[PDB]
Amino acid sequence: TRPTVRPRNDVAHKQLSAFGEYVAEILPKYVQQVQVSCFSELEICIHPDGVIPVLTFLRDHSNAQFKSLADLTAVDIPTRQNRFEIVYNLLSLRFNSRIRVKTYTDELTPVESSVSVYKAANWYEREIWDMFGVFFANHPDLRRILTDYGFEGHPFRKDFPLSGYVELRYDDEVKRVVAEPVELAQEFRKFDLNSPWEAFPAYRQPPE
Amino acid sequence: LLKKTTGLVGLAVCETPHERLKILYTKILDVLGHIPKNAAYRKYTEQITNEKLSIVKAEPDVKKLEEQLQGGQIEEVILQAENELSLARKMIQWKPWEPLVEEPPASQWKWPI
Amino acid sequence: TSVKPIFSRDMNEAKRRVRELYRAWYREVPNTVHLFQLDISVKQGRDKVREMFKKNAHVTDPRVVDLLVIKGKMELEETINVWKQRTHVMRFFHETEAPRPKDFLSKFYVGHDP
Amino acid sequence: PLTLEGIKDRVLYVLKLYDKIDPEKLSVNSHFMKDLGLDSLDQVEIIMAMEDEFGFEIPDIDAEKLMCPQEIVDYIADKKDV
Amino acid sequence: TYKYVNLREPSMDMKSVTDRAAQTLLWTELIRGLGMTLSYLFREPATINYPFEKGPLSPRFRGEHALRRYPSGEERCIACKLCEAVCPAQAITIEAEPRADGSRRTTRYDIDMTKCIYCGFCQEACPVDAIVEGPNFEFSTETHEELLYNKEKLLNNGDKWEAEIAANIQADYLYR
Amino acid sequence: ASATRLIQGLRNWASGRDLQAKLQLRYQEISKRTQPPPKLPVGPSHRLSNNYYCARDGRREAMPPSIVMSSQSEKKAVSPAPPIKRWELSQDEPYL
Numbered sequence: 109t110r111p112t113v114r115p116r117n118d119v120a121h122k123q124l125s126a127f128g129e130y131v132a133e134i135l136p137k138y139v140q141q142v143q144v145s146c147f148s149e150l151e152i153c154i155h156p157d158g159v160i161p162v163l164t165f166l167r168d169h170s171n172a173q174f175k176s177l178a179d180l181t182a183v184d185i186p187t188r189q190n191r192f193e194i195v196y197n198l199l200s201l202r203f204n205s206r207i208r209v210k211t212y213t214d215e216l217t218p219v220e221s222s223v224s225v226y227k228a229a230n231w232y233e234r235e236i237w238d239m240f241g242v243f244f245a246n247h248p249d250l251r252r253i254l255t256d257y258g259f260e261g262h263p264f265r266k267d268f269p270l271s272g273y274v275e276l277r278y279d280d281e282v283k284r285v286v287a288e289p290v291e292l293a294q295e296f297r298k299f300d301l302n303s304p305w306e307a308f309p310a311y312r313q314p315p316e
Numbered sequence: 317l318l319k320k321t322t323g324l325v326g327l328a329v330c331e332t333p334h335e336r337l338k339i340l341y342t343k344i345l346d347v348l349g350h351i352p353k354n355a356a357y358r359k360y361t362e363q364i365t366n367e368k369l370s371i372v373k374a375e376p377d378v379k380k381l382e383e384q385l386q387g388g389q390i391e392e393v394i395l396q397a398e399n400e401l402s403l404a405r406k407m408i409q410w411k412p413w414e415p416l417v418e419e420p421p422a423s424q425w426k427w428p429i
Numbered sequence: 430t431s432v433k434p435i436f437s438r439d440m441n442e443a444k445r446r447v448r449e450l451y452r453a454w455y456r457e458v459p460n461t462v463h464l465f466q467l468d469i470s471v472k473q474g475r476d477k478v479r480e481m482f483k484k485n486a487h488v489t490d491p492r493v494v495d496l497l498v499i500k501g502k503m504e505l506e507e508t509i510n511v512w513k514q515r516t517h518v519m520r521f522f523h524e525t526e527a528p529r530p531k532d533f534l535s536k537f538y539v540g541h542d543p
Numbered sequence: 544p545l546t547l548e549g550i551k552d553r554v555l556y557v558l559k560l561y562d563k564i565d566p567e568k569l570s571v572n573s574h575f576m577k578d579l580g581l582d583s584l585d586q587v588e589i590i591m592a593m594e595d596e597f598g599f600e601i602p603d604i605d606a607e608k609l610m611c612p613q614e615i616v617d618y619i620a621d622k623k624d625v
Numbered sequence: 626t627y628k629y630v631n632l633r634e635p636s637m638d639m640k641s642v643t644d645r646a647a648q649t650l651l652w653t654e655l656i657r658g659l660g661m662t663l664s665y666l667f668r669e670p671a672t673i674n675y676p677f678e679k680g681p682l683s684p685r686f687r688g689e690h691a692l693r694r695y696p697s698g699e700e701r702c703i704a705c706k707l708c709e710a711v712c713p714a715q716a717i718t719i720e721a722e723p724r725a726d727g728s729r730r731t732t733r734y735d736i737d738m739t740k741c742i743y744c745g746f747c748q749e750a751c752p753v754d755a756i757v758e759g760p761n762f763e764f765s766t767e768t769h770e771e772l773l774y775n776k777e778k779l780l781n782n783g784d785k786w787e788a789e790i791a792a793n794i795q796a797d798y799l800y801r
Numbered sequence: 802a803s804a805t806r807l808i809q810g811l812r813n814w815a816s817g818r819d820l821q822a823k824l825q826l827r828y829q830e831i832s833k834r835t836q837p838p839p840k841l842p843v844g845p846s847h848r849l850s851n852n853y854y855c856a857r858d859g860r861r862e863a864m865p866p867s868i869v870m871s872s873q874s875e876k877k878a879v880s881p882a883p884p885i886k887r888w889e890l891s892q893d894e895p896y897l
């Protein structure tokens with residue numbers, strides 16, 4: 109499996125599994141899962157009441173020093189009752205490593221803002237307000253960042269349509285750019301592309 | 317030897333790094349004694365802080381202490397000691413050695429769905 | 430059924446926040462009609478504010494009306510600070526849109542929508 | 544603001560300029576919700592008209608308890624000397 | 626494995642101090658900047674004489690689309706819709722039916738040239754080299770719907786540019 | 802390239818650099834616009850034997866992630882990796 113297959117990094121896998129055990133046993137109040145991917149990325153799935161105590165740990169602890177917040181992300185998964193999956197990506201420049209801190213909320217439960225840990229989060233979770241509708245409590249300036257000013261709805265939710273509900277055009281009667289319900293001259297064509305044969309037997313879920 | 321600059325902007329040169337590290341490490345251990353002994357955070361932080369304090373007590377030279385503390389400049393080692401102290405003072409108030417406050421739902425971390 | 434709130438503990442604090450947001454909008458409407466130089470009256474804009482508050486009047490969940498108050502404060506902040514233009518303020522008034530058929534018979538005549 | 548009769552006449556003047564209240568039922572003891580038939584937001588904009596007239600801010604907890612003109616004039620009397 | 630930009634401690638002997646003060650008072654680096662600008666004044670400029678001179682292109686260039694033909698007059702498109710399944714913009718609309726001799730041929734082959742991102746996934750997905758993205762880039766219109774090509778416009782681009790398209794494919798196809 | 806030697810010397814004096822050795826206009830030193838046809842090589846899996854795809858199936862060696870902890874002694878404190886080695890200053894040009 110040399111030329112076309114990605115080489116497995118067992119050293120980093122062992123080190124990240126050990127540090128995942130380390131974080132899981134220092135903070136058992138909030139750590140719910142710890143997993144390491146086959147391409148060696150550590151995920152620490154925590155409880156949403158421990159957003160600040162976990163992230164302040166990894167930023168400040170001398171065996172962690174995750175001083176950089178690379179990215180902050182939500183993922184809409186509507187089949188869960190807590191549909192939004194808040195993803196922190198952290199970079200330790202000291203130990204040359206990356207960690208992922210995952211948590212969850214629904215539309216109505218607020219998540220605590222992590223600007224007290226990473227000021228970088230000030231826009232990112234604000235984008236999570238704009239795109240997903242997740243509210244962040246004790247945020248300095250929480251408002252929209254990317255959508256238009258009168259925009260109704262949160263676009264990256266998966267029940268939100270691809271084109272929106274409204275569209276703009278200039279109207280010379282009122283001398284104004286106006287919004288109207290969206291009509292497309294050509295509809296977006298939906299492609300059912302998924303093959304009915306199982307692609308990956310390792311990821312098979314057990315039946316009912 | 318009076319290192320002229322640390323190279324990092326906003327991080328000034330520490331004139332007496334050894335006594336500063338000793339004071340910060342003993343203050344870390346004094347704060348960390350208020351955590352219960354069964355907590356893994358106290359065990360691990362006492363272990364690494366005792367290692368760092370013994371390395372600081374074992375080396376008079378500044379640059380050799382920088383190579384064997386394995387944390388870069390000595391001033392960012394001091395900065396990390398201050399961050400660890402502030403962290404431990406927060407960990408006393410948070411009490412995160414307690415059991416898990418709430419189980420996630422049954423398919424909460426099931427991927428793919 | 431034990432959930433974590435946003436700001437309000439029950440519906441009374443929630444209605445208090447709804448009421449203070451309504452006060453802020455009601456005070457703001459003449460300033461909005463002046464500095465955006467809108468071609469509506471002050472009474473017409475205040476009727477639109479009353480309409481936008483009565484549209485959400487059916488909600489009994491404190492978290493949902495807390496988010497409605499938060500989004501109303503965001504819209505008010507985009508209004509007071511001139512971040513909206515005249516167009517974003519006048520999008521509440523669907524003025525270029527033709528009136529939709531309401532009864533059964535006109536909806537039968539125009540098309541297939543129920 | 545000096546005399547209570549002037550404050551009562553001024554409260555009633557603000558209420559009779561407010562167009563939704565029928566002036567036939569507009570009395571000193573006329574309740575806003577169950578007698579006059581107003582929305583809650585109608586009472587809120589009545590209180591804001593009273594702040595326009597009298598010139599001081601009325602908070603939420605002591606404007607929710609102003610359901611008639613007599614409660615309003617007693618509030619304004621209790622927040623001033625008279 | 627790293628270097629320090631701008632970590633030069635200047636000399637404080639009277640030679641270097643007087644050099645820096647003469648630079649301050651006599652504007653040495655300003656005359657260096659004037660000298661570099663004067664140096665480009667006497668260079669031959671890089672300006673080509675468009676429209677008479679043209680910018681250099683390669684045979685891989687991805688410009689205007691064209692439906693091609695086999696060397697008998699028969700069109701190459703066998704209505705297989707791979708170019709519209711692969712199309713990242715959904716610019717290609719295809720409808721097909723068997724024509725009067727039973728050949729699998731399109732009746733609708735539309736490309737919206739204002740949706741198109743000109744990335745050439747259609748010509749590399751095409752199994753029979755029917756759709757290509759030719760070398761024409763000077764096809765600006767005065768109206769939006771003139772950039773909404775049907776099958777007639779694309780087959781006319783093929784008939785218009787085939788003498789060039791076939792040579793470009795001939796020059797490039799051993800890299801494909 | 803067609804500059805006369807008076808303007809060429811004036812230009813080299815004004816720039817401070819020998820400009821003719823490195824002209825930013827391109828001339829006959831560049832490649833031909835017509836090239837011979839290539840013969841591109843094949844990859845390592847272009848073999849007629851010992852080339853079963855189950856021995857070179859990269860996507861089907863991807864495993865689901867190993868769950869290290871799940872909520873259903875005097876061991877050493879660990880870091881996510883060894884600490885980063887201090888970078889060496891450039892031997893080429895450190896500006897020192």
Ligand code: SF4
Pocket residue numbers: 701702703704705706707708709719747750751752753754755756
């Ligand atoms: S142009 Fe090519 S890819 Fe597209 S339908 Fe025709 S034959 Fe298929």
Ligand code: SF4
Pocket residue numbers: 708711712713714715716717736740741742743744745746747748758
């Ligand atoms: S070049 Fe790309 S975007 Fe344009 S028609 Fe081809 S596949 Fe579609």
